[PDB]
Paper text:
The disease is associated with the presence of a plasma cell clone, and is caused by extracellular deposition of misfolding-prone monoclonal immunoglobulin light chains (LC), transported to target organs through blood. LC subunits (ca. 215 residues) consist of two β-sandwich domains, each hosting a disulfide bridge: the highly variable N-terminal domain (Vl, ca. 105 residues), a short joining region (Jl), and the C-terminal constant domain (Cl). Here we present the cryo-EM structure, at 4.0 Å overall resolution, of ex vivo LC fibrils extracted from the heart of a patient affected by severe AL cardiac amyloidosis. We show that the ex vivo fibrils are composed of an asymmetric protofilament hosting 77 residues from the LC Vl domain, coupled to two low-order regions that comprise about one-third of the Vl domain and portions of the Cl domain.
Cryo-EM 3D reconstruction of AL55 fibrils resulted in a map at overall resolution of 4.0 Å, in which the cross-β structure was clearly resolved. Consistent with the 2D analyses, the AL55 density map showed a fibril core whose consecutive β-strand rungs are related by helical symmetry, with a rise of 4.9 Å, a twist of approximately –1.6°, and two low-order outer regions. For each LC subunit deposited along the fibril axis, the inner structured core is divided into two segments: the central part of the density displays a “snail-shell” trace that is surrounded by a second, “C-shaped”, extended polypeptide stretch. Individual LC subunits assemble with a parallel β-sheet topology along the fibril elongation axis, i.e. along the inter-subunit H-bonding direction. Each subunit presents nine β-strands; β1–β5 belong to the snail-shell region, and β6–β9 pack around it in the C-shaped stretch. As previously reported for other amyloid fibril structures, the β1–β5 modeled strands do not lay in a planar arrangement within the fibril; rather, the snail-shell region adopts a β-helix-like structure. On the contrary, the C-shaped region (β6–β9) lays essentially in a plane; given that it is covalently bound to the snail-shell region through the Cys22–Cys91 disulfide bond, this segment in subunit i is located at the i+1 level. Two salt bridges stabilize the fibril core: expectedly, Lys82–Glu84 is also present the native folded state, while the Lys16–Asp95 salt bridge links residues that are 40 Å apart in the folded AL55 Vl domain.
Residue numbers in the entry:
A (entry chain B), B (entry chain C), C (entry chain D), D (entry chain E), E (entry chain A): 1 to 37, 66 to 105
The structure:
């Protein structure tokens, strides 16, 4: 779901840069998650058959960020 | 869902730059999530058959950001 | 859903720049989420058949941002 | 749904610049979400058949932004 | 789900740079998670058959980040 590219970056940052939390779900079939460094690049999926699928899902994500100065702070349930 | 590209960036930022939280869901079939660094680039999916699908989903996402100075603060349920 | 490109950026910002939260949902079939750095670029999907689909979804997203100075603040349910 | 491009930007901003929250939903079939850095660019979808689809969805999005100075503030349900 | 590339980076950052927590789920079948350093690159999946699938999942993710100076702070359940 999340796609991020920075092919030419000059960056100056006094701070905690990449704070990454609570990503998600991937239910995949013959998927191609592809990354690399007459020309032919080829990622190929053929002719499949799927008959019957049933899924039931309950997803609960919790990310809490409490900063500065905190006192008797309650988070969550 | 989320697509972000910065191919030529000169950036100065005194702060916590990329704070990334609570991304989502990917239910995919023969999907191509593609990234790379006579020419032919090729990502190919063929001729499939799917008969019957049933899905039931409950998704609850929670991201809370409490900053500065906080006192007896309650979050969530 | 969210598409953001900055191919040539000169940016100065004293602040927390990219605060990204609560993205969404992707239910896809043979999808092409494509990013790269006689010419032919080619992303191809062929001739498929889908018979019967049934989906029931309940999505609840919660993002709360409480800043400055806060006291006995209640958020959520 | 959300498309944002800034190909040549000179920007000065003392503030938290991109605060992005509560994006949405993508239910797609053979979709092409395309981004890159005799010429031929080609993204192609062929001749498919879909017989019967039924979907029932309930989406509830909640984004709350409480700033400055707050006291006994209640948000949500 | 999470894809991040930085092919040419010059970065200066006095801070804890990559703080990565609470990633997710991958339920995959014949999937290709591909990374490398007349030309032909080829990742290939053939013509399979799947009859009947049933899955029921409950996922609860918890990431909490409490910083600065904290006193009697309660997190979680």
């Amino acid at each position: 779901n999340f796609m991020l590219t920075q092919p030419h970056s000059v960056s100056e940052s006094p701070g905690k840069t990449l704070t990454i939390s609570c990503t998600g779900s991937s239910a995949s079939i013959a998927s191609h998650y592809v990354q690399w460094y007459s020309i032919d690049s080829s990622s190929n999926s053929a002719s499949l058959t799927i008959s019957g699928l049933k899924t039931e899902d309950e997803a609960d994500y919790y990310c809490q960020s409490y900063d500065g100065n905190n006192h008797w702070v309650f988070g969550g349930g």
